[PDB]
Each structure stands twice: as C-alpha cells, then as structure tokens.
Amino acid sequence: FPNTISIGGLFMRNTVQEHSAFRFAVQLYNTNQNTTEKPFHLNYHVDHLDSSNSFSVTNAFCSQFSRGVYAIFGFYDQMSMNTLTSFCGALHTSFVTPSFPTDADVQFVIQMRPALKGAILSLLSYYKWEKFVYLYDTERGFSVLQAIMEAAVQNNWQVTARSVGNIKDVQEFRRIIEEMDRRQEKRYLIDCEVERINTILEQVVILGKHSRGYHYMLANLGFTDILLERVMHGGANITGFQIVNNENPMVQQFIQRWVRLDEREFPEAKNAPLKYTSALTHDAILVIAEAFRYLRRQRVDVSAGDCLANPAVPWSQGIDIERALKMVQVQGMTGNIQFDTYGRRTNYTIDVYEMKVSGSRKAGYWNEYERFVPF
C-alpha cells in the first residue's frame, strides 16, 4: 500500500463553497491523530473547468490523469457530463461526484446525490396529486421527467408538462401561469434549477397565485437555497426535500467547527448558508477515505501514461478501487451512505418539509423500503 494517496479535483464555476468544503474535509482527515483512522496521507490536485469548451475539460482531465491519481472528485453539468463520464469509464478511473445522477447506467462513477424520483412519486401518491402542472427543465437529466410520464400513464393522472428551460422572458412564465389558472390548476411540480424556481415564484407572487388554495412542490434538493419569504406570507403550501439534517450530531459538529474558519483560506464558509453539495463533498471525502482504508486492510495491491493511447489499456487495479468505493456503508452529513452496482445511492433517507406553518417544519421522511413516513 502506498504511503500517500493522491486524488484529483475538478471544480466547475460557482463552486467556491464546495471547494472550501473539499479542502476542509481533506484537512480534517489529515489532522486526525489516530493511526488507525489515518493510515495514509491524503493529497489533492485541484483544477478548475470551463464546462463550455470541451477542449478545456479534456485538457484538465488529462492533466489530472497524467499525474498520479487514484480517484477523481468533481462536478459536471449537462455540457460536461458525457466527456468526464466516458473518459472515466474507458480509463477505469473512479469519478466521485455530488452532481446529478446519470440517466444511463454507467460504470466507474459514484454519484452520491440521492435520486428524488422515488420521493416525488411517493409524495404525489400520498397527497393524491391526480391532476397537476409539471414545469421542468432538462439541466439535471431526464430521469424525473420519464418517471413522471410513466406514472401518469399507469395511474391515469392529468399532468400538464411544460419545458421552461428555454424560456428567457418572464412574460412567458406569466402567460403559462395565467393559462394554468384559467383551467383551475392549483398544484405545481417545479423540477427546475434554483434560479428558475426563484423566477417562477416571483412570477406567481406578482400574479397573486401564492394564496391559500395553491400547492407548490419544489423537486430540488437545496430547499434552504430557494427564496420562499414572500410565498409563505400568502399561505400557499410549499413541499420541499432535503438530505442534510440540522440536528444530526455530525452535521452539528461540522457546522460548529466550520463557521469559525477565516474567509481567506475557506471562502464562502462563515457568512454563508451551507449548501447540500458541500455536505455531499464532505461525505465524498469520507467515502474515499473509508474505501482506501478498506483497500489497505485487505492488502489489495493498488498503485499512468496518457488519456488517448489507442488501443487504450485500462490499469488493472482500478476495478478493485471501484469495488472498494461501492461496498462502503458509512455515516455522513447526509445520513446513511451506500452504493449499488451502478454507483447510485441506496438505502438513503430524504426529509420532507411542509413548512406551510410560519417557519420550516419537517413533515416526514422518505426511505426506499418504508416509502413515506409522515409525522
């Protein structure tokens, strides 16, 4: 086993807090004084992507690959998903990511962002949403959209689906909302980005659609990031989902030790709310450390060239590392962390917040086996 484990980091734009969480988690692992908890020193090579120039993304990935790396933690969007996923799958290099899970079942990628599809379907069945308006964009994949369509077909729902990803003018949102209200539509499932959700909520506030007779289900982890101050005052239902628990002791101690770091080495940390992606980054560091500790425990022999070496020969140990990254069962800031054969999270819990009352109240939780437990 190597005396030092080096990993890579691929950070796209607007990931300052995620970068700070990555550095802080690596430092937390490194400063542990227990030889059993720290059998190897962990280093990282951090590079920043463009995500619009595939040449730049490939250059950064190949610079990471040329130097010795055992795993790559990073982020991708819809424009850089395919390049990184394909390169990692072909070169047998594990890619640990907090980004949206891939629609296709692909290997050598560990996406520890739980899928909202099951929770969304369970809440739709529980609330009995047999007719609603589904406003979606395709910036996080098509899994939720396909699941909604299949559920509507099998359950004979009345789902009015609208793709709002390509809308640049707010009057289009106003027209959509007015048309929906003309048809007496009271229930909206908004599977969009945080900024698009904010724009839609501004439009519904402007049109006065935030009254007590409307329900908005925001299908987006990061409930604390959406601006809901002005929609609460109208009395409308707002269902949200989260994976970070504030009263979790591990989350509590991380926050306690995390809000007292100077904003010169860890920017966007102290005077800023903790995004769920930072918790996923901390959990990713935990998963990597646990997997490599297990590899050392079993005495598995793990120890580059260039990306494009046609005929490409993958390095043999990589598969083992993938297995080590997929058999872990760890407890992190998002709760239980386990992965299936495709790298997707399994046996996870998603907290559901109703927050219709003044403030935020956690209406219940969702689990794969016991579907939805309300309070």
Added chain:
Amino acid sequence: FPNTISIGGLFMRNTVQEHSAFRFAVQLYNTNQNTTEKPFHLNYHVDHLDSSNSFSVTNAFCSQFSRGVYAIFGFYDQMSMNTLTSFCGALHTSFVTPSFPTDADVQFVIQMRPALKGAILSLLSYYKWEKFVYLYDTERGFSVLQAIMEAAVQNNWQVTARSVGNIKDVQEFRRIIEEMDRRQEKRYLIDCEVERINTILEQVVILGKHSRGYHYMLANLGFTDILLERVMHGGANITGFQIVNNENPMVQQFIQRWVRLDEREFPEAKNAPLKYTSALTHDAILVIAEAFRYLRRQRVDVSAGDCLANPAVPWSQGIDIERALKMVQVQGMTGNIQFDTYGRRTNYTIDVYEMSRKAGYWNEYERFVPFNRTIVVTTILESPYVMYKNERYEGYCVDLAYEIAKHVGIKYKLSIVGDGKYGARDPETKIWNGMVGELVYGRADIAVAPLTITLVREEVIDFSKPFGVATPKGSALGTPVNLAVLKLSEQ
C-alpha cells in the same frame, strides 16, 4: 505545395448516402484529365464514430489529426457538436460540415447548411401569420426558436410554443393537436426532425386535421424525406423549403451519373431519393477543391503530434487554410456558395414550395419573390330537460339550445357528459367533474342544462341570468349567450 492533399472524414449513424456521395465526389474530382482543376490528388481518411461516447469521438478526431490532415469533413450531433467544434477551433484545423449551423459564433468551422430563420420569418410575414402554433425540437440549435420568440414579441404575435423533443408517447402528440384544435388554431410551424415531423403528420392524419383550412409549415430542408401523401390528399396546405433545385443542370448531371453507380461500391445510391445532405457533401467537396486550388495558385505555404499537449500549439497554416475556405464562391448543386467571417453561408437562395409547385424563392437582399365551427354543447340526461327520442334528443334544454343557437347564429352538436353529473370539486384531487369540469378543462363550449348558479361554480365558469346557462370563463360566447337568454326571457 504537396502533390497530394489528405483530408479527414467523420461519419455517424444514418450517414450511408452521405458517405457514398463523399466518395463519389472525391472520385469525380480525382478522375478529371484537364490537369488544371486537378493539380493535386485528393486522399481521404474515413472514421465512423458514436456521438453518444465522447471518448470514441475524441479518439477518432485525434487519430485523424495525428495521421496528418488539412481539413476534416464530417457531421456532428447535438452531443458531439461541442467536442468537434472545440477541438477544431483550438487546434486551428478547419471543419467543413453539412450539419446544422452552430448557434454561437465559432472559428474554423465552415457550415454548408444555410440558416432557415430568415426564410421562415419572411414567409410568416408574407402569409400574415398573426397567430400560430410553433412545435420545436431543438436538435438543430436554438437560433430558430429565439428568432421566432423575438419576432413574436416585436410584432405582437400569438405563438403557442411547445417543445416536442422530449415526447416518446404518440398520445402526447394527439393531446397537443386536440388542445390546439380546441382553441381554434389553424396554422402550425413544425421545426422538428424528419422522423418527428412524420410522426406529427401521421397523428394529424389519424385525427383528421389534414382537411382544408389547415396550414402546416415544415421548417426543415427535408421536404422530399417527409411522408405527406395523405396530408395533401386531405386538402391542407403544406409549405416546405428546399435548397436543391432539380432544374439545375449540375444537379441533373450529378443525378444521371449517380443513378448508374454499382450499389456494392456505393450503397444507398439509385435506391433512395437524393438527400439534401448528400448534395451538401458534394458541394463541400467542391468547396474544398476550389479553396485548395486557390491556395496552390496563390503560392501560400501549406504543410502534427497529439491533440492534448499543454501548452497547445496552434497550426501556423490553419489560419490561411480557413481564410481560403471562407472566401470561396462556387456554383454547387445547392446554388451559390459563399461564406462569411464565421463560416455561415451567405447570399443563398431557398426555394419555397406551396403544394407540389415552387411557390417562390427567398434571398437575403430580395426577401421573398413569389411565383363554420361546430360548437360543442354539453348536457345531462334528465327528464324533461334532455330526453332520448342532435335528432336523438328532445326536451326543454334541447329547445333552449336551439333557440340560443338561432339568436347567436351558430351550428352546434349536443353531447351528454359521460359521468352524468353536474359540477363538483373533489376536496382531495381538486378535479371538477361533470359539465362544469368539461367547461373548465376545455372539452365543451356551453352547457345548457339544469345547472344551479352557485358561488363555487361562479368562480370557475360564467353563468348567464337564470332561465342558468354556463360558459367557460373568458370565452367570446359569454355576452351573446347572456343576451340571447335575456331576450328569450322577454318573450
């Protein structure tokens, strides 16, 4: 100047006829004996790549780059567009493509497909389309969609835009068409792929919307690949766009030589109609030949390593090759061929077909040179209001509907609700049932029936004065029906 010029080629799925056209055009260039338009041999490398796997695309591009090429002809999809465009613009290697033009301004990309936004806007202005349904797909870019949106905002149009690129169930197409027909939409602008256009058109044929009075504008240069026999047999108007004119002598010569090619060596020839992408491939070969002939005539110096070598070394001769390729002006099978600073085609002509006959032609400078309702009445089977005997029913409400229609002057058709209920909102699902549900959800236009004027219903539909007669809220029949009810109450 080298005795031979080597070019790369990147082909994908459903690109057999285009590959045959590429090979045949290269053979035609190499088989000339004048020695003036053929001063050098033309060698080609060909790679078939899977666009869904970026690793394979990068492998193919880098293999061709390392082999040594002066330009890459080929196709890109919405997934492989970014990779190929970035790799060509960063390594200063020209990419000649007959695929969709890039929305953004990029360098070292020579796009052989002319843009359709100008022709579509001019045809919309000519036909006076103040209100239409735009079904878009966004598999050839977003330029047309944003152009339509800006034109609608500036000209105060009523465009009902729907994205049909994520639809896999034909019932969704049926529901969209039914919803558009309910709101009295006659004109459709379908900017989608050929297969999606065919699916939409067959759904239209099944729904019987292909009759007279309906206009369908197909925003795709694939008019010959669209199955629309039944659509035009119904009497509807179909406006199409083309770039290949069969009356062009060069096109005729190419076709007469093309239909006599051995299918073993040249698959998809003399078996299927010549796709416009094959014509663009032939014209791209002509463009490459003319540009390199210009380079040789001007005595411009012309000459590798791996793609990914930090810091990247741009090709010194790439700028000259791109400049020569972007100043070419040739008469190809698609007409005049010229390129602007960003590689997009300029000064082109688009033939507009009204159907088939050539309605006219669109050019950038000379813009475009050319050459009642059956209202649904919903009722409920309840004596003596509606009783089985439009001729199948009699009762008070049938006579009331007849009188109201005579005062309004409309043609109607009675239809009793399936569930046989009045309006009621389920507290759990918030769904209205009965006649009020039909009116709210747009499946009916008026409800002459014993429907009590209540507060809960009044908030969702318009009630005339008691006789009340219900109407969907905000419709154009509210005041006429209210006045008719009042006048009938007068007598």
